[PDB]
Amino acid sequence: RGSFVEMVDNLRGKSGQGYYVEMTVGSPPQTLNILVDTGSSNFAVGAAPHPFLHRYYQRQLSSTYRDLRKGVYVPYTQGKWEGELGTDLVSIPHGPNVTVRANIAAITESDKFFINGSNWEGILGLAYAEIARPDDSLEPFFDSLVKQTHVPNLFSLQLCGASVGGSMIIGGIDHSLYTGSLWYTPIRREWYYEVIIVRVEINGQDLKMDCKEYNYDKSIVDSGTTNLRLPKKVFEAAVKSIKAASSTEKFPDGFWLGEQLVCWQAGTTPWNIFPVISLYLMGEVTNQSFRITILPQQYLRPVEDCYKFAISQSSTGTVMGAVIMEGFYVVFDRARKRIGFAVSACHVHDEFRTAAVEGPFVTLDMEDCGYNIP
Ligand SMILES: C[C@]1(c2cc(NC(=O)c3cnc(OCF)cn3)ccc2F)N=C(N)SC[C@H]1c1ccccc1
Incomplete structure (x- = not known):
C-alpha cells in the first residue's frame, strides 16, 4: 500500500493517440501494447495482420488458448471492430506479479479502430460488465484479476x-x-x-x-x-x-x-x-x-x-x-x-x-x- 515503484511510468503514448500499457497474452507470453480505456469493458486485441499493426495476437502459438466459439460485433459512431471470443493467460509485466485467465476478443475485422502510426494493437476496457459486448456475462479483465488474485x-x-x-x-x-x-x-x-x-x-x-x-x-x-x-x-x-x-x-x-x-x-x-x-x-x-x-x-x-x-x-x-x-x-x-x-x-x-x-x-x-x- 502507498508505494508501487515497479508500476510508476508503466504508461506511454503519442499525443492524441492515447495511453497504453504493456501486456502479455498466451504461453509462451506474447507482448502487446494495449490502450487503457475506462470508457469501455472489453479486452480486445489485434489478431490478424492489419497493415497499421506492429504485432498481433497469434492464437496458434499459445498452448493455453481456449476457444469460446462465439463471435462479437462492436459498432460505434466512431468506427467498429469485430472478433472471436476466447480465454488465455494474461499478465502485466510492469504491473502486479500475477497471471490471470481472462476473456480476450481476437480482432479479425475492424474499421477506424486502429490508428495508422500508433504503437498499440489492442484495448483494455476497464469499466463494468453492464457495457461489455456482447452482454454482461462476458467478464471484464479487471473483474477477472480481482476474482483470481489478491489484487x-x-x-x-x-x-x-x-x-x-x-x-x-x-x-x-x-x-x-x-x-x-x-x-x-x-x-x-x-x-x-x-x-x-x-x-x-x-x-x-x-x-x-x-x-x-x-x-x-x-x-x-x-x-x-x-x-x-x-x-x-x-x-x-x-x-x-x-x-x-x-x-x-x-x-x-x-x-x-x-x-x-x-x-x-x-x-x-x-x-x-x-x-x-x-x-x-x-x-x-x-x-x-x-x-x-x-x-x-x-x-x-x-x-x-x-x-x-x-x-x-x-x-x-x-x-x-x-x-x-x-x-x-x-x-x-x-x-x-x-x-x-x-x-x-x-x-x-x-x-x-x-x-x-x-x-x-x-x-x-x-x-x-x-x-x-x-
Ligand atoms: C472503445 C473506444 C476507443 C477509444 C480510443 N481512444 C483513443 O484513441 C484515444 C486517443 N487519445 C486519448 O487521449 C489523448 F492522448 C485517449 N484515447 C481508441 C480506440 C477505441 F476503440 N473508447 C472510448 N472510450 S470512446 C471511442 C471508442 C471507439 C470504438 C470504436 C472505434 C473507435 C473508437
Missing part, C-alpha cells in the same frame, strides 16, 4: 500530457503521484464510471444552468477519450463564457468548434487570457461537494506553436477525457464505489496558475442533478 479492487491513473507518459497503479495508490489531498465523488452506477456534476464555473463565474443539464444524459470518466465533452446546451454556454473571458484576442468562430487550429510564435502562447474551468462534483456527504479546476494547458492541446480547442459538444453526455485526466491523479476506488481526484504531480502548468482540487463546498439538491429516463 485489491482498485486502480489509479496518472496521465501525463505534453510523446506522452504516466502511470497505471493496479491494486493501489502511489502518494508520490499527487499533491494535496484526494477528494472522492461517488460512482452513481457501475456501468461506465458515472459521476454527477453539480456546478460549473468559468474563471470562478457560475454558468447558472440547471445542474441536470450538466449530466444529460450522463457524466463519465473516460481515459479513452481525448476531449472534455459537454452536452450541447452546456457547451454553448461554456464557449460563450470562454469567448468573453478571452476577448482581448479575437479568434475565428471555427476554432471554438474545432474546425480550425490557432497559432502563435514559438514560446509566446498567451495562457493568461484563457480562463480556468471548474467542475464541482458530488461529495461523499449530503450537501457537500468539491471542485476540480483545469487550466488552458489542459484544454488547448498541441498539434505538431499550434493548438486545438479540446472542449467539444456531445450527444452522449459529459465525457471527462484526457483533458480532465491530465490535470489529476484519478483513483478508481471500485471497492468503495467512488472516484478520487487529486492535483497531479505531472500536470502541465505555468508560474501563475496550477490545477486544483478544493473543498468542502455547500451545495444543495445534488441528487436532482442526476438524469433519469422520463
Whole structure:
C-alpha cells in the first residue's frame, strides 16, 4: 500500500493517440501494447495482420488458448471492430506479479479502430460488465484479476500530457503521484464510471444552468477519450463564457468548434487570457461537494506553436477525457464505489496558475442533478 515503484511510468503514448500499457497474452507470453480505456469493458486485441499493426495476437502459438466459439460485433459512431471470443493467460509485466485467465476478443475485422502510426494493437476496457459486448456475462479483465488474485479492487491513473507518459497503479495508490489531498465523488452506477456534476464555473463565474443539464444524459470518466465533452446546451454556454473571458484576442468562430487550429510564435502562447474551468462534483456527504479546476494547458492541446480547442459538444453526455485526466491523479476506488481526484504531480502548468482540487463546498439538491429516463 502507498508505494508501487515497479508500476510508476508503466504508461506511454503519442499525443492524441492515447495511453497504453504493456501486456502479455498466451504461453509462451506474447507482448502487446494495449490502450487503457475506462470508457469501455472489453479486452480486445489485434489478431490478424492489419497493415497499421506492429504485432498481433497469434492464437496458434499459445498452448493455453481456449476457444469460446462465439463471435462479437462492436459498432460505434466512431468506427467498429469485430472478433472471436476466447480465454488465455494474461499478465502485466510492469504491473502486479500475477497471471490471470481472462476473456480476450481476437480482432479479425475492424474499421477506424486502429490508428495508422500508433504503437498499440489492442484495448483494455476497464469499466463494468453492464457495457461489455456482447452482454454482461462476458467478464471484464479487471473483474477477472480481482476474482483470481489478491489484487485489491482498485486502480489509479496518472496521465501525463505534453510523446506522452504516466502511470497505471493496479491494486493501489502511489502518494508520490499527487499533491494535496484526494477528494472522492461517488460512482452513481457501475456501468461506465458515472459521476454527477453539480456546478460549473468559468474563471470562478457560475454558468447558472440547471445542474441536470450538466449530466444529460450522463457524466463519465473516460481515459479513452481525448476531449472534455459537454452536452450541447452546456457547451454553448461554456464557449460563450470562454469567448468573453478571452476577448482581448479575437479568434475565428471555427476554432471554438474545432474546425480550425490557432497559432502563435514559438514560446509566446498567451495562457493568461484563457480562463480556468471548474467542475464541482458530488461529495461523499449530503450537501457537500468539491471542485476540480483545469487550466488552458489542459484544454488547448498541441498539434505538431499550434493548438486545438479540446472542449467539444456531445450527444452522449459529459465525457471527462484526457483533458480532465491530465490535470489529476484519478483513483478508481471500485471497492468503495467512488472516484478520487487529486492535483497531479505531472500536470502541465505555468508560474501563475496550477490545477486544483478544493473543498468542502455547500451545495444543495445534488441528487436532482442526476438524469433519469422520463
Ligand atoms: C472503445 C473506444 C476507443 C477509444 C480510443 N481512444 C483513443 O484513441 C484515444 C486517443 N487519445 C486519448 O487521449 C489523448 F492522448 C485517449 N484515447 C481508441 C480506440 C477505441 F476503440 N473508447 C472510448 N472510450 S470512446 C471511442 C471508442 C471507439 C470504438 C470504436 C472505434 C473507435 C473508437
